[PDB]
Symmetry: C4
Subunit: 274 residues, 4 copies
């Protein structure tokens, strides 16, 4: 088969990271992205793999991910550079049979390793697999500018934040009816923040890290990017509105309820009750 | 003739959707676009059509559109992706002889269907055909950021909104002398919102959906995109001005009247009277 | 010689208009650009000229421009499209021997004509030729967003506007020491506004049209684009500062004087006196 | 070896300047960039050098830079144009054996000379070489929009400015734990401002020029660009927050301390003490 660089998943990783770079969401090495693949996706490209894949342990056992391949962004790597050198900035890893570690089948050249937020990513994948019966396959983190700004001015509360974001663009309730979870500020790159994020992922597809950024989950790269882009678009609208003195009118509870009924989604109750 | 992908209309659809994506007006699947063609436009490309075009009924009879071909964006499709796979994200449809349904002559692969706002689009085309003696051929919907923000702060009234937009850039009165209609918030994707939009299209080339976006109509893709871009540019200026404490000076009624006289347009009376 | 489309001047016109489109300064047909050439620039491309160049009269005699060639943008044409079809959107014109009209040597296909602001352009070229002993060769008009916004909030006065723009970026006084002239609002596309603009051009390289845009003059496309980009950058900074409650500190008169002395420019006295 | 235009350093200079142009940080000739190379980097490209390299003296002796090659942007040159003509807009210079002047080995065609901020650049390189034991190799200056805006509203004090920037994005303390030095406004392009900047560079990797821009230092083009992009991203967030009425919550001192401990950096004490 064609070279792996031309595969749908490598090309998709390039598109998502490049698009996020262009959005201004990924300065420096900010942000990280992981996509769960199937063996059938990568098997045809066996000739492109490293002859002797490097092994690295996980920070904690993840048996649910045993034998599972992922394509991931690297630690310290810049989203802006992914398009310039995919193999340097991305890696395909396959988790071993006990979920204790993984082999780097392709990429992450020059002793690069996967993103330092691997705990947040892999733990969230585990919870999203459970919550969606295996449908979700992507965890994306970026420094979405307006969402970040809003964490300094809105109450850092799931119901309040969710409700404002729903109000900021009509489509929002349909795209994220489960709302947006928000953690307290925590030191990034740790097992603790990864575990805290994964817990929020049990109930929400979006999780905010105050004064830092956002994590999103979805079935495909486009749907996950689109989820974040939707929330960030609403946030952009809100920042403008708040800068102009606040809402004089907005989407009402009754309107949100009608919207949910039409699209067959049940809105997060706490956000709806406000 | 060359492949249909290289046709002026497919290329035009790619340009408009890509440009709107770059403007930040079309996150996820937000927005939709339809362009009315003539049989002579598509006839030369018969060899590129599906051998057995799929049939889909319309939600209501539209006899005015009998036998009329259109190129359209697909339901759930992303403007960002149109350039990557035109046939997946766009379709050429031809309405049948009673205006009861249409055949998908080209595109909308993998069981895709036209935009879920087809009622708003096709009903608006009908009213614009009548209002412009067949000159208007495009209906475009996008999530124009500043216009959306303004719907939370300005009175959601045709005269007031029109007047502010005219004031926000000198060219506005010349580009949309009929003004901007504004609906109450409504659940999107319905026959009701489509009908409500089409009614506003009888009197205006621009219609706002509060907390959602805008619909525009025009004779060509460029003129329709340009119409929306003009209104959105004015809105962008207004958001800046309002964020700085409001207008200390602006275009006066007398100036708007002089402008209308020079360019041979009659400004919407209600907006002028303010 | 190579085809005229590959000439430095056609390529330069494409670059400037495309760059301005990307800046968000030229929605629809907003903006226009004219560049004065020498016969030696176009003579080598005689084979690319129309066999029978169209003649169009000027609105008033301009003997100073007798026998002078220019490359210009067309009326109703979009800056966004120049790169797609240079010959459709641009034209090379040569003013006749009495300065009464011009022939369209190249471009402006399908009966297109030069920009409707030709009076403002050609009259300003005349005054800039006189004011700079023939050094200035470009007149550029665009809808620079932040400058437009500022015309609704700052006093529409040359000294005040100049002084704020100088304060908004250190380089400004060096780039436009003569300041920025500001007209009262006037109906665009007329001989009157053209004449009023040209009068301001006797004393300034930048002229603002309130609630509309800006005109700049310079020796080359890059220097003229750069002049406007500098003023617009300062305006962008100012809009942010004003939105944050205003200046707590800024560049002082004494600092501006020192800056002028170092760079060998004499700052507009009225703006300096504030 | 391949042509020097395809070298990692010429390509890197093109990427950094083009990226900064796209960010809106380098209107006109604003900004300048210098990268310290090793002889081994340029030696393979000897065939591409000027046959008779031009000599230019430095404004003051810099013996620490004796025999050192650099690639630099030119005086009056536009970042936007670097990609179009690298040899016109960039030059490779090699400082002579007493650090009294340099030869232009490549580029800076048509009598171009290095940036007029060469004193700030070369003096800062000297201090950064000392401060980082030769690890830092880049000095970058740009007109970062939000940082500039903040200099009109925040106290122009190292501790205060540093602390706000740390608060504006979690990563900031990790990326610039030494903080951001801020000079008083000074006339640019002088030995004095160069010396003042270099002094600040002894203690900080970022230095602000009020009402003007920023200087950054780092080991590579990407790390230095990323440093500035990080500070500017935080500034962008802050401008939004301040425009919305200010922080209701933010990163606390205790959180910053925990962050520093985790990442093994010691935060600038004065900024932490606030
Ligand atoms: O975004 C990150 C990459 O540095 C970490 O949270
Ligand atoms: O914009 C839309 C596409 O989801 C619908 O109004
Ligand atoms: O900008 C213009 C083009 O329509 C006119 O002033
Ligand atoms: O940015 C500069 C280039 O003009 C100088 O400080
Ligand atoms: Zn992060
Ligand atoms: Zn919509
Ligand atoms: Zn104009
Ligand atoms: Zn500078």
């Amino acid at each position: 088969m064609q070279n792996i660089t031309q595969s749908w998943f490598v090309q998709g990783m390039i598109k998502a990271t490049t698009d996020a770079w262009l959005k201004g969401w990924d300065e420096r090495n900010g942000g990280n992205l992981t996509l769960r693949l199937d063996d059938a996706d990568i098997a045809p490209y066996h000739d492109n793999f490293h002859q002797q894949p490097r092994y690295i342990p996980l920070s904690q056992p993840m048996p649910l991910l045993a034998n599972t391949p992922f394509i991931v962004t690297g630690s310290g790597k810049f989203f802006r550079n992914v398009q310039l050198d995919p193999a340097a900035n991305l890696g395909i890893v396959k988790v071993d049979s006990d979920g204790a570690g993984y082999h780097i089948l392709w990429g992450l050249t020059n002793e690069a390793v996967p993103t330092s937020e691997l705990p947040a990513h892999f733990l969230s994948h585990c919870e999203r697999i459970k919550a969606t019966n295996g449908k979700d396959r992507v965890i994306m983190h970026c420094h979405a500018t307006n969402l970040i700004a809003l964490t300094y001015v809105l109450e850092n509360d799931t119901a309040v934040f969710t409700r404002q974001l729903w109000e900021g663009s009509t489509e929002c309730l349909v795209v994220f009816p489960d709302g947006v979870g928000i953690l307290p500020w925590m030191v990034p790159g740790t097992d603790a923040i990864g575990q805290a994020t994964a817990q929020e992922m049990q109930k929400h597809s979006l999780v905010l890290w105050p004064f830092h950024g956002v994590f999103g989950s979805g079935p495909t790269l486009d749907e996950t990017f689109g989820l974040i882009d939707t929330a960030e678009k609403s946030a952009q609208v809100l920042v403008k509105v708040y800068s102009m003195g606040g809402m004089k009118q907005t989407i009402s509870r009754e309107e949100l309820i009608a919207l949910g009924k039409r699209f067959g989604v049940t809105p997060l109750a706490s956000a709806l009750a406000l």
